[PDB]
Amino acid sequence: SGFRKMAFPSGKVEGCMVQVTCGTTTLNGLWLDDVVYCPRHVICNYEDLLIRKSNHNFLVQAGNVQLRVIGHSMQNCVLKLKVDTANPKTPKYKFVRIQPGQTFSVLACYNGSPSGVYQCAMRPNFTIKGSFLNGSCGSVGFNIDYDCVSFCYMHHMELPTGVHAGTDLEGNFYGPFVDRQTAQAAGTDTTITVNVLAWLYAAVINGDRWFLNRFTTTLNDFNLVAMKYNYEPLTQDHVDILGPLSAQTGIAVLDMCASLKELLQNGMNGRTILGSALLEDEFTPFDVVRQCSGVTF
Amino acid sequence: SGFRKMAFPSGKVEGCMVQVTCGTTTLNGLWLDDVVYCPRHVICTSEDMLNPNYEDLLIRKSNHNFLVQAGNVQLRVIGHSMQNCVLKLKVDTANPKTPKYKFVRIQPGQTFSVLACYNGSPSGVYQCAMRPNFTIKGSFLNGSCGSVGFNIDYDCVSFCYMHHMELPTGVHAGTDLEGNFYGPFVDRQTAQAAGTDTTITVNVLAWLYAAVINGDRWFLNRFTTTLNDFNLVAMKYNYEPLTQDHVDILGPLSAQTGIAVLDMCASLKELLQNGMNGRTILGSALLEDEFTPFDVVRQC
Ligand SMILES: COCC[C@@]1(C(=O)Nc2cncc3ccccc23)CCNc2ccc(Cl)cc21
Numbered sequence: 001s002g003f004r005k006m007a008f009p010s011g012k013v014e015g016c017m018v019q020v021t022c023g024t025t026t027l028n029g030l031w032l033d034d035v036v037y038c039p040r041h042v043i044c045n046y047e048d049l050l051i052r053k054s055n056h057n058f059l060v061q062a063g064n065v066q067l068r069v070i071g072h073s074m075q076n077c078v079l080k081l082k083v084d085t086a087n088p089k090t091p092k093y094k095f096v097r098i099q100p101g102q103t104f105s106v107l108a109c110y111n112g113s114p115s116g117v118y119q120c121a122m123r124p125n126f127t128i129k130g131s132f133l134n135g136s137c138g139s140v141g142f143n144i145d146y147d148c149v150s151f152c153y154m155h156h157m158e159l160p161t162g163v164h165a166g167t168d169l170e171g172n173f174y175g176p177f178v179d180r181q182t183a184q185a186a187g188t189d190t191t192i193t194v195n196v197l198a199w200l201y202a203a204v205i206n207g208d209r210w211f212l213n214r215f216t217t218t219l220n221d222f223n224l225v226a227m228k229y230n231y232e233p234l235t236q237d238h239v240d241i242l243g244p245l246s247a248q249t250g251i252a253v254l255d256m257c258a259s260l261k262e263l264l265q266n267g268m269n270g271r272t273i274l275g276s277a278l279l280e281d282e283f284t285p286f287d288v289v290r291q292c293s294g295v296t297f
Numbered sequence: 298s299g300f301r302k303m304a305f306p307s308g309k310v311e312g313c314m315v316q317v318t319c320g321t322t323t324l325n326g327l328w329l330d331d332v333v334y335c336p337r338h339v340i341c342t343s344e345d346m347l348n349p350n351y352e353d354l355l356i357r358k359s360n361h362n363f364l365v366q367a368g369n370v371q372l373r374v375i376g377h378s379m380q381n382c383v384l385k386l387k388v389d390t391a392n393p394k395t396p397k398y399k400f401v402r403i404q405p406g407q408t409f410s411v412l413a414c415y416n417g418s419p420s421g422v423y424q425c426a427m428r429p430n431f432t433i434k435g436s437f438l439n440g441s442c443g444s445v446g447f448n449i450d451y452d453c454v455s456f457c458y459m460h461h462m463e464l465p466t467g468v469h470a471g472t473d474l475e476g477n478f479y480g481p482f483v484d485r486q487t488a489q490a491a492g493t494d495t496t497i498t499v500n501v502l503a504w505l506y507a508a509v510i511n512g513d514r515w516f517l518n519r520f521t522t523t524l525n526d527f528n529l530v531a532m533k534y535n536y537e538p539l540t541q542d543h544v545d546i547l548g549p550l551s552a553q554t555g556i557a558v559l560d561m562c563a564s565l566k567e568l569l570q571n572g573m574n575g576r577t578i579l580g581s582a583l584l585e586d587e588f589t590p591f592d593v594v595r596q597c
Contacts, residue, residue: 011312131300277582
């Protein structure tokens with residue numbers, strides 16, 4: 001029993017964190033094999049700023065060891081610093097681009113030193129509600145699938161509302177953001193519906209059934225109600241993905257949707273679900289299955 | 298900006314997790330140098346659990362009865378001793394991944410990270426607090442016993458908890474790394490119930506200061522309170538008594554925000570009275586009590 005916001009073990013990622021300094025700017029880098037990946041704004045027309053830099057302008061520190069940069073190239077908004085030493089702690093890894101609603105762990109770092117790990121989701125507006133201070137740029141987001149680390153995010157900036165923006169490890173931003181000091185605002189956010197349903201199933205698995213009802217709904221009627229409450233449209237794929245949870249609890253996805261529809265139109269009425277007075281949307285259906293089954297890495 | 302429940306990076310702890318098997322029971326162990334620490338109930342059957350005589354069960358065991366697996370390598374047990382509710386298995390290999398560590402016993406209200414493990418393999422990391430009733434509201438399934446709680450401060454891992462059991466209410470009980478249980482619990486299948494839980498007041502105040510630091514002042518008021526009057530109100534909401542030590546510990550946050558601890562106590566009193574009225578504080582519709590004053594200073 002128990003349901004917590006759980007992050008993946010950060011060990012395979014900690015062994016990759018390095019400190020990158022370029023002039024006055026100091027941020028974090030991801031050292032995988034002989035390449036250190038970091039936000040290209042460490043050089044701060046990026047092509048023009050980068051061509052004026054030489055390898056020895058980039059100081060890379062892996063713990064108490066200085067790595068010597070032997071090359072540099074830019075891929076989108078990520079700078080790839082070729083180093084002389086291959087990281088012996090390089091895990092089995094992939095660079096994956098995630099979709100809004102998908103969750104991941106963030107190993108927040110300052111000066112190439114990991115300080116904390118937390119779990120979060122890519123919001124439908126492509127921002128992440130992270131916890132980042134100055135110096136955290138280059139901190140990465142990841143998932144683990146067996147022994148393989150799937151790097152999915154690299155922190156680049158904080159928006160004026162306190163939310164965060166970043167890229168995949170190929171340097172492509174999530175959302176309509178640019179790595180430039182300019183007027184940028186997060187779009188209106190929506191609740192990740194499939195995740196709220198998954199979290200309601202996690203509540204049922206943990207013995208919290210007060211919100212269940214005898215009603216069901218059509219998928220179209222649910223989406224008409226959901227659109228009004230700034231909830232993401234629930235697709236047939238979302239219904240299919242919730243299938244295993246529906247089978248485990250004996251509650252049809254559209255039956256759980258009628259419970260969610262009632263929670264949206266009526267509130268919780270002084271009650272909580274899994275110790276929460278708000279509907280949680282940062283657990284995917286897979287996170288619920290992985291946690292209420294004990295999958296290991 | 299942003300405020301999240303943040304666990305410590307689990308790497309230094311992952312390199313210590315091992316699987317311990319004794320007969321049919323399989324749980325986790327903490328391999329530090331040449332000793333593997335694990336709950337002593339690894340030697341118990343489900344029948345033994347009612348009234349186990351651990352001294353009697355342990356004297357019937359030999360080193361080779363304990364199978365210890367570190368990844369895909371079997372460790373040879375060369376000795377065994379019991380310290381309170383922890384079994385200490387002497388092994389023939391010192392863990393090369395042993396970090397700088399301490400065994401610390403924490404007090405209620407203190408927070409820590411839990412690296413939940415199954416079969417000596419880490420599956421997830423989460424942050425939590427030692428409740429005033431000495432339980433932890435963890436997320437543990439069968440096989441998670443021996444998973445540990447820790448804090449990491451300046452390259453040193455402070456092991457503070459080892460998971461032993463789940464109470465009938467779904468909350469968890471365990472020991473420090475010297476095998477002393479937190480709370481009035483025993484490693485016995487007997488009628489054990491968690492005491493009435495209370496909110497960690499000093500932590501809610503710290504989290505209200507974190508909200509002020511992040512630009513949220515809606516809950517503040519023109520009032521102050523006496524410490525005694527605050528405690529009289531707090532007791533009625535099942536909030537832990539706030540002591541002068543708690544007031545002293547909140548001092549740096551009070552100086553950083555310019556809000557006296559007793560003025561913040563007055564906002565808390567008003568929040569308990571009024572509720573949040575559709576508003577949130579740091580994205581929460583409830584008053585958060587699992588961030589200590591030290592965690593707030595750390596994260597901000
Ligand atoms: C022989 O070992 C028994 C373990 C056991 C226990 O609580 N295990 C678990 C611990 N944590 C999360 C659990 C989630 C679901 C189910 C079991 C879980 C089983 C129950 N009676 C008991 C009594 C005293 C003590 Cl100290 C341990 C236990």
